[PDB]
A paper describes a structure:
We proceeded to solve the structure of StCsm6’ bound to its cA6 activator using X-ray crystallography with data to 1.96 Å resolution. The Fobs-Fcalc map revealed electron density consistent with a molecule of cA6 bound to the StCsm6’ dimer, which was fitted into the model. Upon refinement, it became clear there was actually a mix of species in the binding site, which corresponded to intact cA6 and the two products of cA6 cleavage, linear tri-adenylate molecules containing 2′,3′-cyclic phosphates (A3 > P), with occupancies estimated as 0.50 (cA6) and 0.50 (both A3 > P). Given the symmetrical nature of the StCsm6’ interactions with cA6, cleavage takes place at the identical (but opposite) sides of the cA6 ring to produce two A3 > P molecules. Interestingly, the 2′-OH group of ribose and the phosphate involved in cleavage form minimal interactions with StCsm6’; the 2′-OH forms a hydrogen bond with the backbone amide of N10, and an oxygen atom in the phosphate with T11. Like EiCsm6 (24), the 2′-OH group of ribose and the phosphate involved in cleavage form only two interactions with StCsm6’, and neither of them are sufficiently reactive to play a role in catalysis. This is highly suggestive that StCsm6’ does not assist cleavage by deprotonation of the nucleophile or protonation of the leaving group, and instead it is purely the conformation adopted by cA6 in the binding site that drives catalysis, which would be consistent with a function in slow auto-deactivation of the enzyme. Whilst upon binding of cA6 the CARF and 6H domains appear to tighten with movement towards the dimer interface to enclose cA6, at the opposite side of the protein, in the HEPN domain, a number of the secondary structure elements swing outwards to open up the cavity. This is accompanied by a significant rotation of the CARF domains relative to the HEPN domains, of around 58°, making the overall effect akin to opening a pair of jaws upon binding of cA6 (Video Abstract). The displacement of the secondary structure elements in the HEPN domain causes an increase in distance of ∼6.5 Å at the opening to the active site. In turn, this movement brings the catalytic residues closer together in order to form a functional active site.
Residue numbers in the entry:
A (entry chain A): -3 to 294, 299 to 386
B (entry chain B): 0 to 294, 299 to 332, 337 to 386
The structure:
RNA sequence: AAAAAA
């Protein structure tokens, strides 16, 4: 299609078009950047000045003929000062006019603070990141004790205006929102962490400008990410109170809970069988040395362990794993098939879950606190990320 | 547990136009036990008048006044990003969970008032934030500043100096801005394929036109994927049922690699490869598998069936995946030699299905393309 | 309602 035009989106305030022998923000940005289109957002208070605005814009240079879009509806005066209302209004306005194709400029220095705030914020909250320009006061200080030129003769203001030259003094400052963009990225990293997407959180942290806590937070998350992918035990779960296999059991269990939270239900069924199998092997090797080797004159399965628990009169434990044995058919669908699970097969996972937990709680005496590893880690990580 | 007002100081404070400025008006209404004052160079000049005004509210009301150090340079007080960082730091310095804070959204430069409005929600503290409306209830154009006047005169003629003053405060609850931050979080989740986390946000959003559409789209994905089913969007009418199962299960493996969950993918790759081979043999050699089943079939069986049919190119192609059987088989950790195996099986598998089923570049891009539509609807 | 309640 056609090539990009420069479009200046701007509101209008008491300092437009001119004040104190100088350009207001709107005219100054137009004068410097010469946009082809200018979308003008008025309020009831400022609409009376529409003609003087267009006169001022066509007064800049003789071959400068900007296309002036006068937005509709204008902004009601009893809304123009409310923060949250103007945020919505200028979200709506910016979605109405933004195009990927053109090259936009936001005037951050005309109208109420609630409108200027909204423009500054939305530019980055919605990731359009167009050019955002402030215009300094010519006082380079408070405009206290400096009046408004709105009741004056427009043609005079145009003539006396000190910016009415080719070599005007540039009072424009471009915003790049470096610090604010970091806060938005950190917010995303925190959102990811709360929901246990540690890999996605780590991707954000690798692209962050440095600050004190950044390297330890990144180091803590990397170890979690790396170990979990390799199906290892993160350093944080290698409690010295626990034997090595207890650490593997505790971590493998907590990973299925993470898996459940993230909606990976079908993958849970293979993990529950493997963990239960590992726990039973561990229990039988510890309690009946040489039993498994005798049996193995034939990898053992839940069914083999069930027989061994009968042979050893381990009758409570035999009933404990019965719900996990029931979901054997569904585990088979996720392990040797592409057939889908029904909603009943799903609800099993909740039952096996409550069972798995009472199992590991009973055999290894994990505390409520031990089960809370990732929640408690998140707490500390989040505070370290502002 | 005490009430604490954080406030900058502007040209309208302490008094203007026979009325409270924002700082005094908020203090007069809410009576914070503590008031943290952030001056700039320009406004520090009237510190004494500010304190006199604050103590002039009531004889039995003495707020504890904290004069923040360092004051803000006038040459930064007007820049958006700088003032955002500055007041982000200030709020972290003073915030406690035990107290109850108030933010004055109506004193100092627009960049300072914007910073206060934004950080309150961006950073989740969500304390009370108050605007004070001009007594003109309109533009203060043509209204001067009373900073050069007599402070005692101002205090006495102040129309607000009374028990039943006109309440000009407006409490900000940032309903729309809070929704935008939730939408941004939902967008961020979608780009990274956490459809479940995105769904949980969308279930908490105030309704807007597209919401129900976007909700249903994601719910179908989350629900079908959790049951190892095929999302409706992947049931392409151009595809045989089992080709849809194959395309979906492949893309699910890709999703797990993106989310870092490599551990899962080895069992997924085996079943998908087993399913492809059985598809290929059932089509090409009718009854062969039944003949073979005279004494669930595994990769080893399909390998022998490929041998028996002299399909040696195919038997060779699936060799990386059979090699992976040691790693796919407990609770020991994968080493990095096995992590690279998965990467190769993934390329092997992709080329297999491209040959066997002729999936297009676009077909493999289902989730990326769906995210595009979802994201636009969530702006 | 440009660097200071609309």
């Amino acid at each position: 299609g056609a090539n990009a035009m420069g479009v200046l989106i701007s509101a209008v305030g008491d300092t437009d078009p001119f004040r104190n022998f100088h350009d207001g923000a709107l005219i100054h940005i137009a004068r410097k950047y010469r946009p082809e289109k200018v979308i003008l957002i008025f309020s009831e208070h400022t609409a009376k000045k529409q003609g003087n605005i267009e006169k001022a814009l066509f007064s800049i240079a003789p071959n400068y003929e900007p296309e002036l879009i006068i937005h509709d509806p204008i902004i009601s005066d009893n809304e123009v000062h409310i923060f949250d209302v103007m945020f919505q209004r200028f979200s709506d306005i910016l979605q109405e006019y933004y195009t990927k194709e053109d090259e936009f400029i936001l005037n951050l220095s005309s109208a109420t603070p609630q409108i200027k705030s909204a423009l500054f914020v939305i530019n980055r909250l919605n990731g359009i990141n167009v050019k955002a320009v402030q215009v300094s006061s010519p006082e380079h200080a408070s405009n206290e004790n400096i009046g408004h030129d709105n009741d004056e003769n427009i043609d005079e203001l145009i003539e006396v205006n000190k910016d009415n030259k080719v070599n005007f003094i540039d009072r424009t400052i471009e915003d790049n929102a470096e610090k604010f963009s970091q806060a938005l990225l950190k917010k995303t990293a925190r959102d990811f962490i709360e929901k246990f997407d540690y890999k996605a959180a780590l991707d954000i942290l690798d692209q962050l400008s440095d600050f004190p806590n950044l390297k330890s937070v990144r180091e803590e998350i990397r170890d979690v990410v790396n170990c979990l992918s390799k199906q290892d035990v993160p350093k944080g779960l290698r409690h010295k109170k626990l034997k090595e296999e207890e650490q593997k059991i505790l971590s493998a269990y907590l990973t299925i809970e993470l898996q459940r939270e993230r909606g990976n239900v079908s993958e849970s069924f293979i993990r529950i069988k493997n963990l239960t199998e590992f726990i039973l092997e561990d229990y039988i090797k510890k309690r009946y040395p040489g039993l498994i080797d005798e049996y193995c004159e034939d990898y053992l399965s839940l069914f083999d362990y069930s027989k061994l628990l009968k042979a050893t009169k381990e009758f409570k434990l035999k009933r404990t794993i019965a719900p996990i044995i029931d979901m054997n058919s569904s585990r088979n669908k996720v392990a040797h098939s592409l057939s889908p699970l029904d909603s009943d097969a799903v609800k099993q996972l909740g039952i096996a879950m409550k069972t798995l937990k009472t199992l590991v709680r009973e055999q290894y005496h994990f505390s409520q606190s031990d089960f809370n590893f990732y929640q408690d880690l998140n707490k500390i990580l989040l505070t370290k990320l502002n």
